[PDB]
Amino acid sequence: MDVNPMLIFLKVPVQNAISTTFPYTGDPPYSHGTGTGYTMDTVIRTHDYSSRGIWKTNSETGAQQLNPIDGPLPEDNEPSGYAQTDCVLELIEGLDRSHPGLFETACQETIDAIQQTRVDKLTQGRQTYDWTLNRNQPAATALANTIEVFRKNGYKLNESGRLIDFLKDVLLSFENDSMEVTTHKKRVKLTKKNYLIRALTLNTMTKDAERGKLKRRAIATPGMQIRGFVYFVELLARNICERLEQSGLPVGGNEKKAKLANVIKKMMAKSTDEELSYTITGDNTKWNENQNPRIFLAMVLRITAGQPEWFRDLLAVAPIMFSNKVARLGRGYMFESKSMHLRTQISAENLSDINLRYFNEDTKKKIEKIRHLMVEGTASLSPGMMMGMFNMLSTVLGVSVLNLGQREILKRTYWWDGLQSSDDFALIINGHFKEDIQQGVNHFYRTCKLVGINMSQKKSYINKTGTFEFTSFFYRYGFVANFSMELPSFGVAGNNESADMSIGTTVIKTNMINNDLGPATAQMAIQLFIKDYRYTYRCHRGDTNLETRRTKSIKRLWTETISKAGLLVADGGPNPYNLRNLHIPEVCLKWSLMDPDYRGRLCNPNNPFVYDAVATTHSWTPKRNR
Amino acid sequence: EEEFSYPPTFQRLANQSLPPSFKDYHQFKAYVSSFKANGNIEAKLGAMSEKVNAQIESFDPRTIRELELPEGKFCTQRSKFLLMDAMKLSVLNPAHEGEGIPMKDAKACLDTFWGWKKATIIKKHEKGVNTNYLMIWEQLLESIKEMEGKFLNLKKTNHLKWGLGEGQAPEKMDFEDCKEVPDLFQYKSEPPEKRKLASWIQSEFNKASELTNSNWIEFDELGNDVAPIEHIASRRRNFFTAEVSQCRASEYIMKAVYINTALLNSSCTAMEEYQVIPIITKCRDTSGQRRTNLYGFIIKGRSHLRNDTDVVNFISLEFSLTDPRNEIHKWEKYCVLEIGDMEIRTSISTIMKPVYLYVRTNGTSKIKMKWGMEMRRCLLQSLQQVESMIEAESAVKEKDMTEPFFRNRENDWPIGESPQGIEKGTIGKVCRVLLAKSVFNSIYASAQLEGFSAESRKLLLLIQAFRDNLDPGTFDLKGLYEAIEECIINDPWVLLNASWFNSFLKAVQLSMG
Amino acid sequence: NPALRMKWMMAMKYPISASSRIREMIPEKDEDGNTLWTNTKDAGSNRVLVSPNAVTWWNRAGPVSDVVHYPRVYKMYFDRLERLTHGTFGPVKFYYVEVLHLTQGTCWEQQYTPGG
RNA sequence: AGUAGUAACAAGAGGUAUACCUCUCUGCU
Ligand SMILES: [Mg+2]
Structure with a gap:
């Protein structure tokens, strides 16, 4: 016999045991080295889809920009960026017609949220580029450095603490032709062109630990001055996208399965004996490199129509900043020699003015193709978006295309509906014959080609309605299996005893709530977490036969106290947890079981040692880095 | 009321962020804010060419082709330990005054094997100085018997430094000093060579x-x-x-947990020495009495890890009973000695077999030790x-x-x-x-497995959609086949998984005639 | 990585930074041969490094104080406990917000009346 | 040599000066 697990699919459907085709227990792939090859590949691939635009030299930054929209219509199935803008304004007007009062209510609540936002709301979130250092930093440090450098020069409008005043300071700071920045010493002086290029810079790294890609890719982090406008625009688009029923974002958990079952219940309700219904499961190819920011400017100027003009300007800043962006090309390259047996490192700013006899064939071709885009070590990137920035406006545009296909609007022999999330879409098409379904697919695909949305012909497939997949939510006949998120390691997080205990139990609880964790898997996760906990803090049970540095005093504490079921795990007591009591912290679960001398020795405030938990002597503070 | 207006510099920036037929930001705002459409989409879809359409080709799994597997040398083993070939020296219910300390348990398991013959080479490493592997085993066998304490650190000899690769990284200069070498080039970035299953x-x-x-x-x-x-x-x-x-997979789980835990502890604790690490698992029998099994030794190298991908080299020496001369393509990386003889007294016969030792120079990183x-x-x-x-x-x-x-x-x-x-x-x-x-x-686990699984899941779901009488169909199936087949290069698990998918596809062909 | 940092920091002898007034209550040596504090300090802040045997020593042989305010200080956690233990369960019906991991699953559900 | 895979690790930052030196305890039955 030769063992084959895929033969399991001969007995069950594939939708039941699809969790065997997810190899998420080994290490995900990482990238060793520079992200310069990937970022130059992104720039070259972006300027090769919008090739028939118009090249205009930018007046201020001096960089060569490219304008794809209102351009020639495509004539193949390769991805193109030529989005006609009257079609974009038409789809936004139709989305306004189908939902009365939507854009006004979203804009009204955004204006309500603008005048009561403090500047420390920028401190939240992930890392951020810092142009005073040319380095990624935390958001709080980059914000503090930007406020300090603005305070040295004559820009102090953010003294009131608000955020719109800090954006006023940001816009006013482009006046200064004499920006002096203390660099590592000597305080160097930026000119106006250098500061204006440094403000519009995205810092590009390689995305590590991603699942489902053989070859790596590049992602980018925005600057500090462009974080606030992006936050306000994403707030408006978030307030819109929560009210379109065809938007998969930003909800999740059990409030996403209801959307799939709702659109299947709607679109397959009143089907006659002839009313065929098909379903396309589809991914979009090149979702980043084809949505132009000027299309987003037309969208945020059509959405905010009739609003006060300060609102239109404040929300229109972010596409204007994004259509002039540059890209920092990373950390150079590494050269070697095996005769003299030595290696060297070259930086990114030498790429435009080096001899090309040191590179291979393909990288020399890449430098020759990117050489005419260099501005002070950065490459101009006017066409195309980069990943992660505008995640809800793209969903708004896709929902507009899905809202084109109503019966009252089309008046054809086909109609459609469905869901769109980020760059993942599920489209349900009803018609009378199969050729009507084919013509409806053609109308959808050709309409998507007019706004930059490119359906991937390789990774999409169509069948009859009942089984499909939307962002790794697998729907079969009314049953949704969720495999969107990775099954996390249920180990300790590394704070202390009590903090890691409470964090682990609440993590298993929220995974049972959100990501469909079964009860038996939850019990085995409790077992694995307590096993790794008792190893990590050297706090195994009292009656054990092991030996560590704590087993002497743990042994004495076990033998001396009487009600042995009342000690905590870090005192070598028994694990009390099960499925019904994951939300209770450990000190409260064993309160009535503790003998009062042990409890009084535990929760004394006078000890020198000192998640929603109690405070005991186990809540100590670890050794800092020396 | 609130106020927000552009400075002149940002205004000259904003006049260049428009559709190309416009010239002023306020003019484009006035065009957008008073737009009343008249069916422009119909004019564009009547004006767009007819090559741009999503044509459906219907799916039929009784006619599709099998996935291709590449050609080259046979694929060789790349695990950190021997999987089905490893031999374990066991101690039943140990009590030896160390009692859990790994070098004491390794000495207690080593003393239960008499029959140390003189070590010779029986399968050479192809690209290595095999006398260094022989002298590494002789040095470890000498230095085990003279240990006084809880940890063994080895003396930095020449052959141990070759076997761990010390001094092989070239020196790092400034660019301005050496930019005039005819041999200077970029680091080699070729795709991997393909291997036959x-x-x-x-x-x-x-x-x-x-x-x-x-x-x-x-x-x-x-x-x-x-x-x-x-x-x-x-x-x-x-x-x-x-x-x-x-099952044996639980034994592999426990062995990998113990090896990577000991490697991370010796890397973050003693990051200077050649620290000998043993391979221990602890189990019970079906009678409940404990047992300590030893599989082999691991000699660490230097570990100055700052990134998450910096590599520490080690030398793994694992006992075995499988003569490597019967499947010699499997062990291109190893260097196999013959170190002993063992007596098997079983229910049929009472024979002797030579005990071999598999020595290789492996490497690992911090993220691989964490995930292991x-x-x-x-x-x-x-x-x-x-x-x-x-x-x-x-x-x-x-x-x-x-x-x-x-x-x-x-x-x-x-x-x-x-x-x-x-x-x-x-x-x-x-x-x-x-x-x-x-x-x-x-x-x-590697990247080719991620690409292969993520791109073959759609073929599985298309076959499932066929078998439920749901009439599937695709738009470009050759691109899906190429996107799967580019992710099969040289990993043995990916090649085996593609063979498993080919056998599944032939089975579901043969199901419906 | 903070988890790996905790794992190699607990392997060393002195991982816990205790306050500098620990020397007046608990001695240096153990009854079993372990050291409970050195005379080191932390990174700039004068807190003497200890071993976790000091924590277990306090838990088994510390100064007993009085703890009666904890049913009122951390009252919401004991409220969770009492609403769990005085509530009775029900059947598994195949077809509140706190226990939604328990009484509302992927396919099944479970009747659960709370305490009272 | 070896890990690995579209580019890297195979020690690096320094002092006197091509040789030394400061910094950057480990027990999961
Ligand atoms: Mg999809």
């Missing part, structure tokens, strides 16, 4: 699903069960742990497959399908392909096979 990895996955006579994984206690869903969960979990514990410390997730994930299928049968029957799913003492599930046809086993064989699949997905 060999015949041993199917044997490894065969033997990694069979029961053994030990009880490997020992879980903790749980609280007092009260709720009925806790009783259902306890039923499912206790059947699974009763059926999955004694957490191989116990395999024991989770397979359960979350099997239990999930139970829920997948509870939503089309609307009852607790727990009990008529584990009390099915009958060969029901297909799991194999013999030369007689497709073979069926019980549900416990499925649990052991899914645990072995998760373990081998964690040992041989």
Whole structure:
């Protein structure tokens, strides 16, 4: 016999045991080295889809920009960026017609949220580029450095603490032709062109630990001055996208399965004996490199129509900043020699003015193709978006295309509906014959080609309605299996005893709530977490036969106290947890079981040692880095 | 009221962020804000060319072709330890005054093997100085017997520095000093060379699903069960742990956990010496008496790790009884000595066999040691497959399908392909096979596996959509085939998984005639 | 990585930074041969490094104080406990916000009346 | 040599000066 697990699919459907085709227990792939090859590949691939635009030299930054929209219509199935803008304004007007009062209510609540936002709301979130250092930093440090450098020069409008005043300071700071920045010493002086290029810079790294890609890719982090406008625009688009029923974002958990079952219940309700219904499961190819920011400017100027003009300007800043962006090309390259047996490192700013006899064939071709885009070590990137920035406006545009296909609007022999999330879409098409379904697919695909949305012909497939997949939510006949998120390691997080205990139990609880964790898997996760906990803090049970540095005093504490079921795990007591009591912290679960001398020795405030938990002597503070 | 206006510099920026036929930002705002459409989309869709359409080609799995497997040399082993070939020296219920310290247990297991002959080479490393491997084993055998303490650190000899590769990294200069060498070039960035699928990895996955006579994984206690869903969960979990514990995949889990834990502790504690690390697992018998098994030694190198991908080299020396001269393509990386003789007194005969030692120079990183410390997730994930299928049968029957799913003492599930046809086993064989699949997905994990699984899931779902009479169809199937087939280069697990998909596709062809 | 940092920091002898007034209550040596504090300090802040045997020593042989305000200080956690333990369960019906991991699953559900 | 895979690790930052030196205890039955 030769063992084959895929033969399991001969007995069950594939939708039941699809969790065997997810190899998420080994290490995900990482990238060793520079992200310069990937970022130059992104720039070259972006300027090769919008090739028939118009090249205009930018007046201020001096960089060569490219304008794809209102351009020639495509004539193949390769991805193109030529989005006609009257079609974009038409789809936004139709989305306004189908939902009365939507854009006004979203804009009204955004204006309500603008005048009561403090500047420390920028401190939240992930890392951020810092142009005073040319380095990624935390958001709080980059914000503090930007406020300090603005305070040295004559820009102090953010003294009131608000955020719109800090954006006023940001816009006013482009006046200064004499920006002096203390660099590592000597305080160097930026000119106006250098500061204006440094403000519009995205810092590009390689995305590590991603699942489902053989070859790596590049992602980018925005600057500090462009974080606030992006936050306000994403707030408006978030307030819109929560009210379109065809938007998969930003909800999740059990409030996403209801959307799939709702659109299947709607679109397959009143089907006659002839009313065929098909379903396309589809991914979009090149979702980043084809949505132009000027299309987003037309969208945020059509959405905010009739609003006060300060609102239109404040929300229109972010596409204007994004259509002039540059890209920092990373950390150079590494050269070697095996005769003299030595290696060297070259930086990114030498790429435009080096001899090309040191590179291979393909990288020399890449430098020759990117050489005419260099501005002070950065490459101009006017066409195309980069990943992660505008995640809800793209969903708004896709929902507009899905809202084109109503019966009252089309008046054809086909109609459609469905869901769109980020760059993942599920489209349900009803018609009378199969050729009507084919013509409806053609109308959808050709309409998507007019706004930059490119359906991937390789990774999409169509069948009859009942089984499909939307962002790794697998729907079969009314049953949704969720495999969107990775099954996390249920180990300790590394704070202390009590903090890691409470964090682990609440993590298993929220995974049972959100990501469909079964009860038996939850019990085995409790077992694995307590096993790794008792190893990590050297706090195994009292009656054990092991030996560590704590087993002497743990042994004495076990033998001396009487009600042995009342000690905590870090005192070598028994694990009390099960499925019904994951939300209770450990000190409260064993309160009535503790003998009062042990409890009084535990929760004394006078000890020198000192998640929603109690405070005991186990809540100590670890050794800092020396 | 609120106020926001542009400065002149940002205004000259904003006049260049428009559609190309405009010239002023306020003019484009006035065009957008007073736009009344007149069916522009119909004019564009009548004006766009007719090559731009999503044509449907209908899917038929009785006509599609098999996935291609590449050509080259046979694929060789790349695991950190020997999987089905390793031999273990055992101590039953140890009490030797160290009692858990790994070097004391390694000495206690080494003293139960007499028959140390003079070590000679029987399979050479192809690109190595094999006398350095022989002298590394002789130096380790000398330095074990003279240890006084809890840790052994080796003397920095010449052959040990070659075997760990010290001094092989070239020097790092400034660019302005050496920019005038004719030999200077970029680091080599070729794609990997393709490899033909060999015949041993199917044997490894065969033997990694069979029961053994030990009880490997020992879980903790749980609280007092009260709720009925806790009783259902306890039923499912206790059947699974009763059926999955004694398999070899649990032994590989425990061995990988112990090796990577000891490697990370010696890397972050003593990051200067050549620290000898032993390979220990601890198990019980079916009678309950403890047992300590030793598999081999690992000599660490220097570990100045600052990134998450910086590599520490090590030398792994593992005992075995498999003569490597019968499958010699499997061991291109190794260097195999012959170090002893062992007496097998079994129920049939009473013979002697030579005991070999497999020596190789491997390397690992910090993220690989971290993810190898957490191989116990395999024991989770397979359960979350099997239990999930139970829920997948509870939503089309609307009852607790727990009990008529584990009390099915009958060969029901297909799991194999013999030369007689497709073979069926019980549900416990499925649990052991899914645990072995998760373990081998964690040992041989690479990027090609991610690409292959993520691109073959659509072929599985298309075949499933065909078999439910849902009439599937695709738009570009050759691109899907090429996107799968580019991710099959040289990993043995990816080549074996593509062979498994080819056999599944031929089986579902033969199902419907 | 903070988890790996905790794992290699607990392997060393002195991982816990205790306050500098620990020397007036608990001695240096153990009854079993372990050291409970050195005379080191932390990174700039004068807190003397200890071993976890000091924590277990305090838990088994510390100064007993009075703890009666904890049913009122951390009252919401004991409220969770009492609403769990005084509530009775029900059947598994195949087809509040706190226990939604317990009484509302992927396919099944469970009747659960709370305490009272 | 070896890990690995579209580019890297195979020690690096320094002092006197091509040789030395400061910094950057490990027990999962
Ligand atoms: Mg999709």
